Symmetry: C3
Subunit: 161 residues, 3 copies
Amino acid sequence: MDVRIGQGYDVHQLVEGRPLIIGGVTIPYERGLLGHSDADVLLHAITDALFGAAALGDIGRHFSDTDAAFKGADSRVLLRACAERVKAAGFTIQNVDSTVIAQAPKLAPHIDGMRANIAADLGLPLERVNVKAKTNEKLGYLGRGEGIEAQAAALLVKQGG
Amino acid sequence: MDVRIGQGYDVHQLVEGRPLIIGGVTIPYERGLLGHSDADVLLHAITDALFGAAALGDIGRHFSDTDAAFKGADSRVLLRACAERVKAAGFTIQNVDSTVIAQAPKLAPHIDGMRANIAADLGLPLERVNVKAKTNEKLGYLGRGEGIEAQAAALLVKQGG
Amino acid sequence: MDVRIGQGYDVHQLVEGRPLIIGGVTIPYERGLLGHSDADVLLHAITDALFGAAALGDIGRHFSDTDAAFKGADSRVLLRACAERVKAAGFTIQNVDSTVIAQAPKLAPHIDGMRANIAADLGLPLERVNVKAKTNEKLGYLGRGEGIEAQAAALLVKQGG
Ligand SMILES: Nc1ccn([C@@H]2O[C@H](COP(=O)(O)O)[C@@H](O)[C@H]2O)c(=O)n1
Ligand SMILES: Nc1ccn([C@@H]2O[C@H](COP(=O)(O)O)[C@@H](O)[C@H]2O)c(=O)n1
Ligand SMILES: Nc1ccn([C@@H]2O[C@H](COP(=O)(O)O)[C@@H](O)[C@H]2O)c(=O)n1
Ligand SMILES: Nc1ccn([C@@H]2O[C@H](COP(=O)(O)O)[C@@H](O)[C@H]2O)c(=O)n1
Ligand SMILES: Nc1ccn([C@@H]2O[C@H](COP(=O)(O)O)[C@@H](O)[C@H]2O)c(=O)n1
Ligand SMILES: Nc1ccn([C@@H]2O[C@H](COP(=O)(O)O)[C@@H](O)[C@H]2O)c(=O)n1
Ligand SMILES: [Zn+2]
Ligand SMILES: [Zn+2]
Ligand SMILES: [Zn+2]
């Protein structure tokens, strides 16, 4: 088994006037993430971990502002597209694990929805997808609720068939 | 062989009047970590990584306030119970690696004691457990000594036989 | 296959009067990283991830500023020495992935040069080395351009022959 590791990072500012969408789940909340389209910090981090494991670069290098195929793409579309490219490069996905750091709101009741979304987008059963939530103990911009961070890890095997 | 990756994160505030306990090792110091029980930032991060690798959620999901069987539990008990559940889920542990970010004090003389505690609670030989230490170059709440961070990574195998 | 995971972290201050050297690549910029020698945040993070995976401790414990054999060693010499120690411990490197978090300058056109330096230094083909770049969305010291962080992950196999 030619096994490979990938890691990903993302962060977005939390601001008034926007919906909170994490792992494709809309979480009712006074504020939301700032960025293009749905600003899905968790989906972006996983997308980068998968591209990383496959030595395919990063989410920026694959998905430009001018790319014709992804005009009006949101984060789930990019995640499905990433999955396709990783497959096409000759890899299979062992599993994904992740952590979202948000001081608030509480994410635990929404985690299973995030798992179902990610598993579908990756062609994985639920048992190979995991998402964990953590506060930042009121430390830093994350602790102050100025932002939300996601960390991801992915393991692939290059077939190798 | 069905290999799986997990990653974990923890952080605690560093305050007056608490002992500093990291990797189960009490380290002489004028401040210590805040949180329930012993606030062992490093064991918590390793625990989350193991649960993540097993797709079992996170520490918070497993170890609540109201569980009869774990009041009185400190971080080593939780790490041992985590190991038991990972084994009960059908997995074996390949190894763990980690980093503790603290501007001070020096952790290097205490690292081997941390490794031995962790290997014992996970039933691993020392040679499969690693702990590393970093400062934060005087940047951020970590660099100012307002908290301590731990990062961890675990690799399991779903047996598989 | 006796597979093992490693993870690494580094951060350095960004200051006037220093070159910006990341992954062995000099990137013209008004500011550069503070630290001994070249202060190569990326190469240090990768070095730690590899020592971690082999359970050989960390970069600081291996490379003393007192060691005769490495005074005047820059970060590429350290990464090469690291690779050599990991080999003698009986390990082979599957792959390395990483992220550099810098608000600026743009790193994308320099990434392939970094990958080439890393692949050379580790004895790997380019296909097993990845480097990704992220801003910090103007958050925190990273966001304000006061430093640069690197994250790494490495996968080893203990021979196992
Ligand atoms: N310093 C930086 C930061 C980001 N980038 C590129 O910009 C893309 C978008 O990054 P952000 O999401 O941080 O805005 C990244 O995925 C990477 O391709 C870069 O090339 N240099
Ligand atoms: N809907 C989206 C979301 C993100 N992206 C690209 O994904 C990369 C990372 O996303 P963020 O900068 O929003 O974290 C960016 O380069 C952005 O251009 C995109 O092209 N379309
Ligand atoms: N935003 C957050 C942060 C934490 N949590 C849950 O709270 C539990 C403990 O979080 P902390 O260690 O950050 O206090 C986490 O393990 C997670 O289960 C959550 O559901 N939503
Ligand atoms: N002694 C302890 C320490 C932690 N825990 C659980 O571990 C979770 C994560 O730990 P921290 O919040 O202290 O990082 C907490 O939400 C708490 O429920 C516990 O139940 N008993
Ligand atoms: N709190 C700390 C921070 C660093 N260290 C040691 O110092 C060495 C260099 O650390 P820095 O690069 O963060 O300065 C580390 O690799 C580790 O060996 C330590 O033992 N305790
Ligand atoms: N040129 C260099 C760069 C780093 N090092 C060692 O590498 C470790 C990590 O480097 P930094 O503290 O500069 O991130 C330190 O212990 C430093 O002593 C070295 O000995 N020679
Ligand atoms: Zn994003
Ligand atoms: Zn904790
Ligand atoms: Zn460094």
